[PDB]
Scaffold this active site. Sequence first.
Site, PDB file in Angstrom:
ATOM      1  N   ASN A  12      -2.572  -1.781  11.354  1.00 59.04           N
ATOM      2  CA  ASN A  12      -1.543  -1.054  11.867  1.00 59.04           C
ATOM      3  C   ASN A  12      -1.477   0.564  11.807  1.00 59.04           C
ATOM      4  O   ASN A  12      -0.450   1.169  11.948  1.00 59.04           O
ATOM      5  CB  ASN A  12      -0.178  -1.714  11.305  1.00 59.04           C
ATOM      6  CG  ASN A  12      -0.186  -3.127  11.531  1.00 59.04           C
ATOM      7  OD1 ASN A  12      -0.366  -3.602  12.737  1.00 59.04           O
ATOM      8  ND2 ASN A  12       0.004  -3.852  10.459  1.00 59.04           N
ATOM      9  N   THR A  13      -2.537   0.934  11.097  1.00 61.26           N
ATOM     10  CA  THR A  13      -2.674   2.725  10.975  1.00 61.26           C
ATOM     11  C   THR A  13      -3.684   2.877  12.088  1.00 61.26           C
ATOM     12  O   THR A  13      -4.945   2.225  11.626  1.00 61.26           O
ATOM     13  CB  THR A  13      -2.872   3.200   9.536  1.00 61.26           C
ATOM     14  OG1 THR A  13      -1.674   3.052   8.977  1.00 61.26           O
ATOM     15  CG2 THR A  13      -3.297   4.662   9.579  1.00 61.26           C
ATOM     16  N   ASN A  57      -7.786  -9.343   4.581  1.00 62.81           N
ATOM     17  CA  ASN A  57      -6.591  -8.879   5.383  1.00 62.81           C
ATOM     18  C   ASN A  57      -6.182  -9.491   6.351  1.00 62.81           C
ATOM     19  O   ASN A  57      -6.725 -10.374   6.897  1.00 62.81           O
ATOM     20  CB  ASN A  57      -6.672  -7.026   5.514  1.00 62.81           C
ATOM     21  CG  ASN A  57      -5.434  -6.506   5.423  1.00 62.81           C
ATOM     22  OD1 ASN A  57      -4.208  -7.042   5.899  1.00 62.81           O
ATOM     23  ND2 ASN A  57      -5.479  -5.035   5.008  1.00 62.81           N
ATOM     24  N   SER A  79      -5.992  -2.229   7.006  1.00 60.95           N
ATOM     25  CA  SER A  79      -4.746  -2.327   7.761  1.00 60.95           C
ATOM     26  C   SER A  79      -4.805  -2.278   9.222  1.00 60.95           C
ATOM     27  O   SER A  79      -5.728  -1.252   9.637  1.00 60.95           O
ATOM     28  CB  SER A  79      -3.701  -1.410   7.310  1.00 60.95           C
ATOM     29  OG  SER A  79      -2.391  -1.560   8.114  1.00 60.95           O
ATOM     30  N   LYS A 126     -10.269  -3.877   0.083  1.00 60.41           N
ATOM     31  CA  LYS A 126      -9.789  -4.834   0.822  1.00 60.41           C
ATOM     32  C   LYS A 126     -10.316  -4.827   2.187  1.00 60.41           C
ATOM     33  O   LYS A 126     -10.233  -3.624   2.877  1.00 60.41           O
ATOM     34  CB  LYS A 126      -8.063  -4.788   0.763  1.00 60.41           C
ATOM     35  CG  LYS A 126      -7.542  -5.847   1.676  1.00 60.41           C
ATOM     36  CD  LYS A 126      -6.120  -6.135   1.110  1.00 60.41           C
ATOM     37  CE  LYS A 126      -5.653  -7.295   1.816  1.00 60.41           C
ATOM     38  NZ  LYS A 126      -4.048  -7.632   1.227  1.00 60.41           N
ATOM     39  N   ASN A 156       2.794  -8.960  11.753  1.00 64.79           N
ATOM     40  CA  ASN A 156       3.590  -7.711  11.239  1.00 64.79           C
ATOM     41  C   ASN A 156       2.916  -6.423  11.868  1.00 64.79           C
ATOM     42  O   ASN A 156       1.591  -6.208  11.909  1.00 64.79           O
ATOM     43  CB  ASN A 156       3.782  -7.659   9.644  1.00 64.79           C
ATOM     44  CG  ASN A 156       2.395  -7.002   9.081  1.00 64.79           C
ATOM     45  OD1 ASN A 156       2.646  -5.852   8.959  1.00 64.79           O
ATOM     46  ND2 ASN A 156       1.382  -7.725   8.709  1.00 64.79           N
ATOM     47  N   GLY A 210      -3.640 -17.225   3.794  1.00 67.66           N
ATOM     48  CA  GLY A 210      -3.257 -18.586   4.166  1.00 67.66           C
ATOM     49  C   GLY A 210      -3.358 -19.773   3.044  1.00 67.66           C
ATOM     50  O   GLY A 210      -3.569 -21.005   3.271  1.00 67.66           O
ATOM     51  N   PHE A 237       2.503   0.977   6.794  1.00 72.62           N
ATOM     52  CA  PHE A 237       2.284   1.604   5.411  1.00 72.62           C
ATOM     53  C   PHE A 237       3.821   2.224   5.252  1.00 72.62           C
ATOM     54  O   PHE A 237       3.960   3.646   5.022  1.00 72.62           O
ATOM     55  CB  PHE A 237       1.262   2.698   5.549  1.00 72.62           C
ATOM     56  CG  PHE A 237      -0.029   2.114   5.268  1.00 72.62           C
ATOM     57  CD1 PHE A 237      -1.296   2.745   5.375  1.00 72.62           C
ATOM     58  CD2 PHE A 237      -0.278   0.576   4.935  1.00 72.62           C
ATOM     59  CE1 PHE A 237      -2.590   2.185   5.007  1.00 72.62           C
ATOM     60  CE2 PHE A 237      -1.698   0.112   4.710  1.00 72.62           C
ATOM     61  CZ  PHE A 237      -2.456   0.582   4.679  1.00 72.62           C
ATOM     62  N   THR A 247       0.878  -1.337  -0.018  1.00 76.59           N
ATOM     63  CA  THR A 247      -0.012   0.033   0.031  1.00 76.59           C
ATOM     64  C   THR A 247       0.796   1.345   0.042  1.00 76.59           C
ATOM     65  O   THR A 247       1.675   1.376   0.688  1.00 76.59           O
ATOM     66  CB  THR A 247      -0.874  -0.060   1.205  1.00 76.59           C
ATOM     67  OG1 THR A 247      -1.816  -1.055   0.943  1.00 76.59           O
ATOM     68  CG2 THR A 247      -1.698   1.292   1.223  1.00 76.59           C
TER      69      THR A 247
HETATM   70  C1  FMN Z   1       4.954  -7.839   6.110  1.00 75.80           C
HETATM   71  C2  FMN Z   1       3.522  -7.755   5.690  1.00 75.80           C
HETATM   72  C3  FMN Z   1       3.284  -6.833   4.988  1.00 75.80           C
HETATM   73  C4  FMN Z   1       1.991  -6.435   4.366  1.00 75.80           C
HETATM   74  N1  FMN Z   1       1.680  -5.036   3.803  1.00 75.80           N
HETATM   75  C5  FMN Z   1       0.254  -4.952   3.213  1.00 75.80           C
HETATM   76  C6  FMN Z   1       0.063  -3.674   2.715  1.00 75.80           C
HETATM   77  O1  FMN Z   1       0.795  -2.743   2.590  1.00 75.80           O
HETATM   78  N2  FMN Z   1      -1.277  -3.467   2.007  1.00 75.80           N
HETATM   79  C7  FMN Z   1      -2.291  -4.462   1.958  1.00 75.80           C
HETATM   80  O2  FMN Z   1      -3.288  -4.355   1.646  1.00 75.80           O
HETATM   81  N3  FMN Z   1      -1.866  -5.630   2.599  1.00 75.80           N
HETATM   82  C8  FMN Z   1      -0.656  -5.972   3.396  1.00 75.80           C
HETATM   83  N4  FMN Z   1      -0.338  -7.189   3.963  1.00 75.80           N
HETATM   84  C9  FMN Z   1      -1.412  -8.266   4.062  1.00 75.80           C
HETATM   85  C10 FMN Z   1      -1.213  -9.245   2.839  1.00 75.80           C
HETATM   86  O3  FMN Z   1      -1.189  -8.474   1.690  1.00 75.80           O
HETATM   87  C11 FMN Z   1      -2.377 -10.477   2.903  1.00 75.80           C
HETATM   88  O4  FMN Z   1      -3.423  -9.949   3.006  1.00 75.80           O
HETATM   89  C12 FMN Z   1      -2.130 -11.084   4.392  1.00 75.80           C
HETATM   90  O5  FMN Z   1      -0.687 -11.391   4.604  1.00 75.80           O
HETATM   91  C13 FMN Z   1      -2.696 -12.464   4.116  1.00 75.80           C
HETATM   92  O6  FMN Z   1      -2.444 -13.312   2.862  1.00 75.80           O
HETATM   93  P1  FMN Z   1      -1.231 -14.520   3.487  1.00 75.80           P
HETATM   94  O7  FMN Z   1      -1.715 -15.413   4.464  1.00 75.80           O
HETATM   95  O8  FMN Z   1      -1.020 -15.418   1.977  1.00 75.80           O
HETATM   96  O9  FMN Z   1       0.233 -13.824   3.714  1.00 75.80           O
HETATM   97  C14 FMN Z   1       0.856  -7.572   4.409  1.00 75.80           C
HETATM   98  C15 FMN Z   1       1.165  -8.844   5.044  1.00 75.80           C
HETATM   99  C16 FMN Z   1       2.729  -9.024   5.443  1.00 75.80           C
HETATM  100  C17 FMN Z   1       2.912 -10.161   6.298  1.00 75.80           C
HETATM  101  O1  ORO Z   2       1.880  -1.961   6.131  1.00 76.46           O
HETATM  102  C1  ORO Z   2       1.020  -2.485   7.122  1.00 76.46           C
HETATM  103  O2  ORO Z   2       1.376  -2.236   8.071  1.00 76.46           O
HETATM  104  C2  ORO Z   2       0.098  -3.267   6.826  1.00 76.46           C
HETATM  105  C3  ORO Z   2      -0.992  -2.992   6.095  1.00 76.46           C
HETATM  106  C4  ORO Z   2      -2.266  -3.898   5.492  1.00 76.46           C
HETATM  107  O3  ORO Z   2      -2.860  -3.641   5.060  1.00 76.46           O
HETATM  108  N1  ORO Z   2      -2.091  -5.060   6.109  1.00 76.46           N
HETATM  109  C5  ORO Z   2      -1.018  -5.664   7.029  1.00 76.46           C
HETATM  110  O4  ORO Z   2      -0.966  -6.743   7.575  1.00 76.46           O
HETATM  111  N2  ORO Z   2      -0.190  -4.950   7.323  1.00 76.46           N
END
Ligand code: FMN
Ligand code: ORO
Length: 381
Positions: A191-192, A272, A189, A243, A118, A321, A122, A93
């Site tokens: 985390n904001t 997410n 997210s 999302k 995590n 997952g 952003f 993002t």
């Molecule tokens: C280090 C990390 C950073 C991520 N940064 C973003 C982000 O910037 N914007 C967003 O929409 N999702 C973000 N996600 C969420 C992933 O895009 C995804 O939705 C989430 O990891 C679930 O999918 P997964 O189980 O395959 O990892 C992040 C996830 C991780 C682990």
């Molecule tokens: O950059 C992040 O902190 C972040 C954004 C998001 O949309 N999802 C997430 O798990 N982390």
Amino acid sequence: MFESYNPEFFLYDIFLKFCLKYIDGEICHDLFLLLGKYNILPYDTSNDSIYACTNIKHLDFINPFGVAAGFDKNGVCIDSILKLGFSFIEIGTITPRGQTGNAKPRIFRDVESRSIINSCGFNNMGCDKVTENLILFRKRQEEDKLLSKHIVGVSIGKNKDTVNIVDDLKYCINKIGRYADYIAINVSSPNTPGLRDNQEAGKLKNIILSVKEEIDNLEKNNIMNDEFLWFNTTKKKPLVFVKLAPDLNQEQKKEIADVLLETNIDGMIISNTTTQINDIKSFENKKGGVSGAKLKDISTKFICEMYNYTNKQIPIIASGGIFSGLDALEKIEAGASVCQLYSCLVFNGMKSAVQIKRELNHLLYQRGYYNLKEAIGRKHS
Ligand SMILES: Cc1cc2nc3c(=O)[nH]c(=O)nc-3n(C[C@H](O)[C@H](O)[C@H](O)COP(=O)(O)O)c2cc1C
Ligand SMILES: O=C(O)c1cc(=O)[nH]c(=O)[nH]1
Ligand SMILES: Cn1nc(O)c(C(=O)O)c1COc1cccc(C(F)(F)F)c1
């Protein structure tokens, strides 16, 4: 046995199991991006099965697996990541101004459960710099026939101190929108602070309509220009996705679905990361969103609910997952038209796309499907 360009080359798994046990998560990730930046990654340019292609409106995905947002937050190695075997990537993002994000370390793994937590917040170079990076990809894509059909979406969010989220989303549309095949509005997210409140129906509706109006004005005000406006894969106006977070009660989910139907969103990304998991004692005193295998069942059920709550009228991008062909088919039969990976890349490495594509094709055979499209939503009958 020096064919190092092959994503299944045995040495990659060896380096990865060593990284998993000894090297900080975010350091591993930046090493990956560095390899990609210098075009050192392996690649699989082989032909994907036409029987596993898929679409969301006019977006024609050459295969059903893309890279979720947050993996290339800054869009610095789009080419290299796609050439691992993925049909698309969601960069971001991104926010209008750059941010360093929350304090480090802020990415933690648990191999036992193949799960990540995590608290990134952003971290990104900001919309204007990421736009320059995306433009460079788009110019390379023009010369490279082998990337001509790959898709790039952009996830957009708000800076941490921004008062009105909509101002920040509009800024991103007006700078990077003409280069994106789709826009993902990030209201989920964890985390904001305060971001997830925008999933309230009234707030979300205003956000969606504001974003669509800005994209419409962009076209309205610029399609007459000499330079062709849509410098993207589709050569069309970007579609708009939302999302959503899995952490919502049933009433919110239904009220959101009503809003998605009325505003005509082009798709929903489900989902997410979650803040609901605490039975991982390795994460026991950490903050942020949990990804990976422990998110799979929660988000699959969420896909089923929003598929039904929107009466199957809103295409679904699955995230959460997905590691195996069985996982991908569960998402698709639940109602998803495409799948996004993040955690699979962390724990399975370079071979993620080639192996999951092979496993899915075998599954479509064993289960009696003519093509992947036939499986979409088949759980519901
Ligand atoms: C280090 C990390 C950073 C991520 N940064 C973003 C982000 O910037 N914007 C967003 O929409 N999702 C973000 N996600 C969420 C992933 O895009 C995804 O939705 C989430 O990891 C679930 O999918 P997964 O189980 O395959 O990892 C992040 C996830 C991780 C682990
Ligand atoms: O950059 C992040 O902190 C972040 C954004 C998001 O949309 N999802 C997430 O798990 N982390
Ligand atoms: C291991 N790990 N932990 C993280 O938090 C991340 C991430 O990206 O979030 C990763 C992925 O990092 C690599 C994946 C495959 C191969 C390699 C290697 F560089 F070893 F080839 C790294």
